[PDB]
RNA sequence: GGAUAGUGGCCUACCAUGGUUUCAACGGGUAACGGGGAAUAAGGGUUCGAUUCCGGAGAGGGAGCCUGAGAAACGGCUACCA
RNA sequence: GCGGUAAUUCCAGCUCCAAUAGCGUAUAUUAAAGUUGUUGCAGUUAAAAAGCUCGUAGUUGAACUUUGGGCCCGGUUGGCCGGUCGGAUUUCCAACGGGGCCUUUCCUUCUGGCUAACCUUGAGUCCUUGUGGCUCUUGGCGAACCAGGACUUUUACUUUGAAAAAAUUAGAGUGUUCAAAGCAGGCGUAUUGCUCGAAUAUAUUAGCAUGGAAUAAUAGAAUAGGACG
RNA sequence: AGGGGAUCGAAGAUGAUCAGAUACCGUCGUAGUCUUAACCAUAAACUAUGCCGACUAGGGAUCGGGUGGUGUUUUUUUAAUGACCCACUCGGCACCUUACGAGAAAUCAAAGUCUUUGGGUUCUGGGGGGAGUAUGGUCGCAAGGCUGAAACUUAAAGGAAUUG
């Protein structure tokens, strides 16, 4: 989520061990680190362009992605810097030899490299436990905005 | 079929196999697309127009002599209403029925039709709402329905 | 209904309605078989010799013995117009 | 009955059917060119008009609406096509 | 409202046969119906059929003999695991030597015998005996 | 197609509906209500031992006329009091009050045997031995 | 940040208002350790699994700890309750 | 249902029947039960359609979008021969499958690495009057997949396969004297050893991997904020 | 809670009948019956028969809409009309005859197209009593409505048809 400020905390925010020698007058102020999570996921430019901090960013932070890669549909974005997706799926009761609709919500961290609104299909990746619930991290938006601007005023 | 009744009435138009021509129909898209617009411009609903073209003139199927459905002529020329006209007319009726209900609290039958009429509105509203033609969160309320029509 | 090697096994291969080609079973005692005569030169009817039709008791009961005969006799050569394939 | 052509129904029994229950379905209305010989030129009219079709140049009349088929006015003539 | 267009077409075929008729009119046809219609015929269960062409959803006239007792539809197109197919045939075909369960696979609509030989499976559509 | 949802996803409904309807099954209900453990004089067990409080003379139901010899027993693990039949000619002469006896069911699944009203149990042993054995002559009833 | 072998509201501080639910959350019951399996034989099912193998939990009930590579151990200790 | 005086049911004697080192009885559960019904019930009068309509969840939901035709290679059953000293393959023949083409036809994609394959061909030719046949470098196939970049509308189904504990189950082999079992055993020079074994299957829901692209969803270009360059 | 309160008339009081007669029949007649503003939510609220869709069979009436017709009648001068007549077509309330078919039958054009058992979907029943009882919840001014068990008892209860 973030938005604005960057130094909005009691502790000074910084990328660990990414020194900038004040003696060397430079143009970029802060040297910034980044990587690619791998598995073929492009690291969005907003991660390399940005100045947000986030130690739980999969491109600019100290996490790794390894394990289940899942996709789900965004259903809540009220948490700051983390979301809840719903993964729906059908479930085969035998005996009746058909299925019933089930689901589970899955809480997932979300780097301010992405701007997510509710309804977006998103691909997330497996994480070291990041928080009490969260064990996943948004890792690409396979969506956009769900055609909102083609809902406008009048002729 | 028959949504809010137990009618079983199969009445309808029977459109011809002939998806073009009428061959004995001279004139031209030119002439008739313009024809649509001037009426749209008067203030008529595409339906009223499709009719006032079916009788006075030779416009059998407005989509045929002009490869377009009348409501698309209208939008394309920016003549298209706030809300679709079926929805427009449902709402317009609900208002007048309501107006009767307010002056006639004793008329339970009218209360019953209002529900019906409003229920259709609400389903329809949802359709258009689902398919972009209305904004998400477009809503119908009595309190503000009267303004919508007139 | 043969078997392992040629050999026609199990008896009675049954008749068939000439109008519906369903089986004509035993207790079907409503069914029928109509022998129409083979005629020759100047009136006269070659006896022993027939063009033969079989009709299911069903068909008869359903009132279609007569029409379904018109159509059969005609398109086998023994009716001249009478019937129509269009309605 | 029991055996027939459903692919080639006879003219007059298809004719008498309902316009949606014909083999392929189609209308059974028609258009006409009508004239009230005060004016010279002649307008195109629908057999089931709903709209009381005014004439081209004058505000005379022509046909009134009905149950179905329009009822034309006193001294006029027509033709299908 | 019209629920399984196949269902009606199948059922109609059956009612004309049972009342001894030789032709049906069916409405409204579909890819699937034809592809079904086509399987029966391939095995003699019906004559020929004409797609008449309203500018709508279609009609068909089937020409049927009498070799046909029932041609029903399986109303939820269940899934079959190529093992399971014996189970279906066994449950609704009169003997293990004629009659077909036609179904629907990646490799096309096709009776179970063909579907056996090609070695594919999928959903189950209907049957003919 | 009267009734049950036939759809391919209608599984959930189909089970719950079943769930809800087994309750009309008389001994599906018994089973999960624990009517054994809760009601029933015995635990939910095959037999139960008890103590003979008094010897009764239950008169049989119609159209039979007879006196059916029975003992009121107080189940040990319970104090639940229960009247029990004492099968075969005599045998009531084998019991006496305060004796311990082995009750057992009548094989009608709860439910009175026949013209004995109320009695849902029968005696199998007394003072540890078995009526049956006593009845024949094979064995003798213990001292005190 | 502290604590841990180490992630992690695991704990603390500051901050925010979130998290779950008729696709049954939350609560109640279970005469409930879970599985491999067992019984009943057209099939579909129904019922059962304390119990020879695998996993977990316990050592009268709780809690705490010493030693140690490994125990919150009970044929170790300490305290309370019985 | 028997017994209230000739009791085919009680108490016995005789005789008889059923299962038999075993056979009653009690409780539970399973089959019989299509009396819980997905397969598969019933509901006018036997138990059961809510007085009525609206309606959310839920389930359900008309038709239509590469079809039809042409050529190529190579498989496995089966026939009619057997060339052979029980089984063998060539051409002849069906029939049923798999693969790649060309028909206006993404195969995601550019950049080499590679080539396995012919429009090649460079000579000619074992040899049946030759397109029956393959070794064979010098202009001319992509994709068979490497690895590096740049990017990919979502799903359900279904195939095949991996990853898998044993005992249990199904089942092969072996004559524990039989059998339940067990996993042994079997040959001899039985005086200094020879040897076959200790299979196979099922293991599904989920996750993984690969083929298919019917059926059923999803997304797309309409205030063009479209698509290619 | 107002108003209205002709009539008929729960209650009650009477005349009679009766062994009795708290009744039936007769008289008086409170509430009620009607209406407004609020409640209540139940009837054998019935077709004891869910709704949507497809298909399967003959007949004559009728109700509404429609198309056709050198139909009849209205006369005026012939039309226009209106009503009537005949054929067709949709959609109604129904009746008739059938039996392809269904069913335990009575019967049923659905209650048919089901062991040749699958178009979609909702709801209810699972032997009889106990009992719509107890308990909790809830709605109601009340009366009561909705939801709704067990123990225990029991071999039947029940349905259609036949002969008596
Ligand atoms: Mg927050
Ligand atoms: Mg509706
Ligand atoms: Mg309709
Ligand atoms: Mg209409
Ligand atoms: Mg009940
Ligand atoms: Mg007593
Ligand atoms: Mg105790
Ligand atoms: Mg924290
Ligand atoms: Mg809060
Ligand atoms: Mg539930
Ligand atoms: Mg326990
Ligand atoms: Mg266990
Ligand atoms: Mg269990
Ligand atoms: Mg225990
Ligand atoms: Mg321990
Ligand atoms: Mg102890
Ligand atoms: Mg405590
Ligand atoms: Mg301890
Ligand atoms: Mg000890
Ligand atoms: Mg120990
Ligand atoms: Mg005697
Ligand atoms: Mg005797
Ligand atoms: Mg005896
Ligand atoms: Mg036995
Ligand atoms: Mg099934
Ligand atoms: Mg039943
Ligand atoms: Mg009833
Ligand atoms: Mg009803
Ligand atoms: Mg309700
Ligand atoms: Mg479809
Ligand atoms: Mg598999
Ligand atoms: Mg094994
Ligand atoms: Mg009064
Ligand atoms: Mg009185
Ligand atoms: Mg008196
Ligand atoms: Mg009284
Ligand atoms: Mg009621
Ligand atoms: Mg009635
Ligand atoms: Mg009729
Ligand atoms: Mg009671
Ligand atoms: Mg009796
Ligand atoms: Zn004019």
UniProtKB/Swiss-Prot annotation, chain A:
The keyword Ribosomal protein applies. Its main location: cytoplasm. The modification N-acetylserine is found at residue 1. Keywords: Acetylation, Cytoplasm, Isopeptide bond, Ribonucleoprotein, Ribosomal protein, RNA-binding, rRNA-binding, Ubl conjugation. There is a cross-link at residues 14, 45, 55-56, 78, 95, 104, 132, 140, 147 (Glycyl lysine isopeptide (Lys-Gly) (interchain with G-Cter in ubiquitin)). Gene3D superfamilies: 2.40.50.1000. InterPro entries: NA-bd_OB-fold, Ribosomal_uS17, Ribosomal_uS17_arc/euk, Ribosomal_uS17_CS, Ribosomal_uS17_N. One of its GO terms (biological process) is ribosomal small subunit assembly. N-terminally acetylated by acetyltransferase NatA. One of its GO terms (cellular component) is cytosol. Component of the ribosome, a large ribonucleoprotein complex responsible for the synthesis of proteins in the cell. The small ribosomal subunit (SSU) binds messenger RNAs (mRNAs) and translates the encoded message by selecting cognate aminoacyl-transfer RNA (tRNA) molecules. The large subunit (LSU) contains the ribosomal catalytic site termed the peptidyl transferase center (PTC), which catalyzes the formation of peptide bonds, thereby polymerizing the amino acids delivered by tRNAs into a polypeptide chain. Component of the small ribosomal subunit (SSU). Mature yeast ribosomes consist of a small (40S) and a large (60S) subunit. The 40S small subunit contains 1 molecule of ribosomal RNA (18S rRNA) and 33 different proteins (encoded by 57 genes). The large 60S subunit contains 3 rRNA molecules (25S, 5.8S and 5S rRNA) and 46 different proteins (encoded by 81 genes).
Curated annotation (Swiss-Prot), chain B:
Its main location: cytoplasm. The modification Phosphoserine is found at residue 31. GO terms for cellular component: 90S preribosome; cytoplasm; cytosol; cytosolic small ribosomal subunit; nucleolus. It is found in: Cytoplasm. Keywords: Cytoplasm, Isopeptide bond, Phosphoprotein, Ribonucleoprotein, Ribosomal protein, Ubl conjugation. It comes from the Eukaryota. Belongs to the universal ribosomal protein uS15 family. Component of the ribosome, a large ribonucleoprotein complex responsible for the synthesis of proteins in the cell. The small ribosomal subunit (SSU) binds messenger RNAs (mRNAs) and translates the encoded message by selecting cognate aminoacyl-transfer RNA (tRNA) molecules. The large subunit (LSU) contains the ribosomal catalytic site termed the peptidyl transferase center (PTC), which catalyzes the formation of peptide bonds, thereby polymerizing the amino acids delivered by tRNAs into a polypeptide chain. This is Small ribosomal subunit protein uS15. It comes from Saccharomyces cerevisiae (strain ATCC 204508 / S288c).
Swiss-Prot record, chain C:
The modification N-acetylmethionine is found at residue 1. Its main location: cytoplasm. It holds the Pfam family Ribosomal_S21e. N-terminally acetylated by acetyltransferase NatB. InterPro entries: Ribosomal_eS21 (IPR001931), Ribosomal_eS21_CS (IPR018279), Ribosomal_eS21_sf (IPR038579). GO terms for cellular component: cytosol; cytosolic small ribosomal subunit. Disulfide bonds: none annotated. One of its GO terms (biological process) is endonucleolytic cleavage in ITS1 to separate SSU-rRNA from 5.8S rRNA and LSU-rRNA from tricistronic rRNA transcript (SSU-rRNA, 5.8S rRNA, LSU-rRNA). It is found in: Cytoplasm. Keywords: Acetylation, Cytoplasm, Ribonucleoprotein, Ribosomal protein, rRNA processing. One of its GO terms (molecular function) is structural constituent of ribosome. It comes from the Eukaryota. Disruption phenotype: Reduction in growth rate, a decrease in free 40S subunits, an increase in the amount of free 60S subunits and a decrease in polysome size. Present with 27400 molecules/cell in log phase SD medium. There are 2 genes for eS21 in yeast. Component of the small ribosomal subunit (SSU). Mature yeast ribosomes consist of a small (40S) and a large (60S) subunit. The 40S small subunit contains 1 molecule of ribosomal RNA (18S rRNA) and 33 different proteins (encoded by 57 genes). The large 60S subunit contains 3 rRNA molecules (25S, 5.8S and 5S rRNA) and 46 different proteins (encoded by 81 genes). Belongs to the eukaryotic ribosomal protein eS21 family. PANTHER family: 40S RIBOSOMAL PROTEIN S21. This is Small ribosomal subunit protein eS21A.
UniProtKB/Swiss-Prot annotation, chain E:
It holds the Pfam family Ribosomal_S8. It is found in: Cytoplasm. InterPro entries: Ribosomal_uS8, Ribosomal_uS8_CS, Ribosomal_uS8_sf. Keywords: Cytoplasm, Ribonucleoprotein, Ribosomal protein. GO terms for biological process: cytoplasmic translation. PROSITE patterns: RIBOSOMAL_S8. Present with 40400 molecules/cell in log phase SD medium. This is Small ribosomal subunit protein uS8A. It comes from Saccharomyces cerevisiae (strain ATCC 204508 / S288c) (Baker's yeast).
């Amino acid at each position: 989520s973030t938005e604005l400020t960057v130094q909005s905390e009691r502790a000074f925010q910084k990328q660990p061990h990414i020194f900038n020698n004040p003696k060397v007058k430079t143009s970029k102020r802060t040297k910034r680190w980044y990587k690619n999570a791998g598995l073929g996921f492009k690291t969005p430019k907003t991660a390399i362009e940005g100045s947000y901090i986030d130690k739980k960013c999969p491109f600019t932070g100290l996490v790794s992605i390894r394990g289940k890669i899942l996709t789900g549909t965004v259903v809540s974005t009220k948490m700051h810097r983390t979301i809840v997706i719903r993964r729906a799926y059908l479930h085969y009761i035998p005996k009746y030899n058909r299925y019933e609709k089930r689901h589970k919500n899955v809480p997932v961290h979300v780097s301010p490299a992405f701007r997510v609104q509710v309804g977006d299909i998103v691909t997330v990746g497996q994480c070291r436990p990041i928080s009490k619930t969260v064990r996943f991290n948004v890792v690409k938006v396979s969506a956009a905005a769900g055609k909102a601007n083609k809902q406008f005023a009048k002729f | 079929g028959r949504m809010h009744s137990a009618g079983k009435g199969i009445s309808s138009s029977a459109i011809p196999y002939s998806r073009n021509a009428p061959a004995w129909f001279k004139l031209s898209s030119e002439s008739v697309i313009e024809q649509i617009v001037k009426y749209a411009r008067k203030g008529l609903t595409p339906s009223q127009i499709g009719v006032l073209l079916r009788d006075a003139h030779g416009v059998t199927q407005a989509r045929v002599i002009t490869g377009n459905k009348i409501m698309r002529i209208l939008k394309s020329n920016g003549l298209a209403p706030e809300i679709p006209e079926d929805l427009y007319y449902l709402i317009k009726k609900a208002v007048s029925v309501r107006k009767h209900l307010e002056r006639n609290r004793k008329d339970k039958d009218a209360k019953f039709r209002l529900i019906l009429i409003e229920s259709r509105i609400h389903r329809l509203a949802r359709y258009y709402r689902t398919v972009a033609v209305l904004p998400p969160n477009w809503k119908y309320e009595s309190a503000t329905a009267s303004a919508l029509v007139n | 209904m043969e078997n392992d090697k040629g050999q026609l096994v199990e008896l009675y291969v049954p008749r068939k309605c000439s109008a519906t080609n369903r089986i004509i079973k035993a207790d079907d005692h409503a069914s029928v078989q109509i022998n129409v005569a083979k005629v020759d030169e100047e009136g006269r009817a070659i006896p022993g010799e027939y063009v033969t039709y079989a009709l299911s008791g069903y068909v008869r009961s359903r009132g279609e013995s007569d029409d379904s005969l018109n159509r059969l006799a005609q398109n086998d050569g023994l009716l001249k117009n009478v019937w129509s394939y269009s309605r | 009955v029991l055996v027939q052509d459903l692919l080639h129904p006879t003219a007059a029994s298809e004719a008498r059917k309902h316009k949606l229950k014909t083999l392929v379905q189609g209308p059974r209305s028609y258009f006409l060119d009508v004239k009230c010989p005060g004016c010279l030129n002649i307008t195109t009219v629908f057999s089931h008009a709903q709209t009381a079709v005014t004439c081209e140049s004058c505000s005379t009349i022509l046909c009134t609406p009905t149950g179905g088929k329009a009822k034309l006015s006193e001294g006029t003539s027509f033709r299908r096509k | 409202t019209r629920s399984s267009v196949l269902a009606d077409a199948l059922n109609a075929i059956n009612n004309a046969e049972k009342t001894g008729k030789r032709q049906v009119l069916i409405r409204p046809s579909s890819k699937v119906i034809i592809k079904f219609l086509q399987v029966m015929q391939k095995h003699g269960y019906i004559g020929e059929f004409e797609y008449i062409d309203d500018h709508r959803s279609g009609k068909i006239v089937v020409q049927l003999n009498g070799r046909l007792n029932k041609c029903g539809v399986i109303s939820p197109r269940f899934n079959v695991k190529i093992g399971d197919i014996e189970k279906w045939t066994a449950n609704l075909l009169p003997a293990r030597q004629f009659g077909y369960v036609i179904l629907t696979t990646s490799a096309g609509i096709m009776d179970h015998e063909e579907a056996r030989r090609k070695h594919v499976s999928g959903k189950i559509l209907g049957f003919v005996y | 197609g009267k009734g049950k949802p036939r759809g391919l996803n209608s599984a959930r409904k189909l089970r719950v509906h079943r769930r809800n309807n087994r309750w009309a099954e008389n001994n599906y209900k018994k089973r999960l209500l624990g009517t054994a453990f809760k009601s029933s004089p015995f635990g939910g067990s095959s037999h139960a031992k008890g103590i003979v409080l008094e010897k009764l003379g239950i008169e049989s139901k119609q159209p039979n006329s007879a006196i059916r010899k029975c003992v009121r027993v107080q189940l040990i693990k319970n104090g639940k009091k229960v009247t029990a039949f004492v099968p075969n000619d005599g045998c009531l002469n084998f019991v006496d009050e305060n004796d311990e006896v082995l009750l057992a069911g009548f094989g009608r699944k709860g439910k009175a045997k026949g013209d004995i009203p109320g009695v849902r149990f029968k005696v199998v042993k007394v003072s540890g031995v078995s009526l049956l054995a006593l009845w024949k002559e094979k064995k003798e009833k213990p001292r005190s």
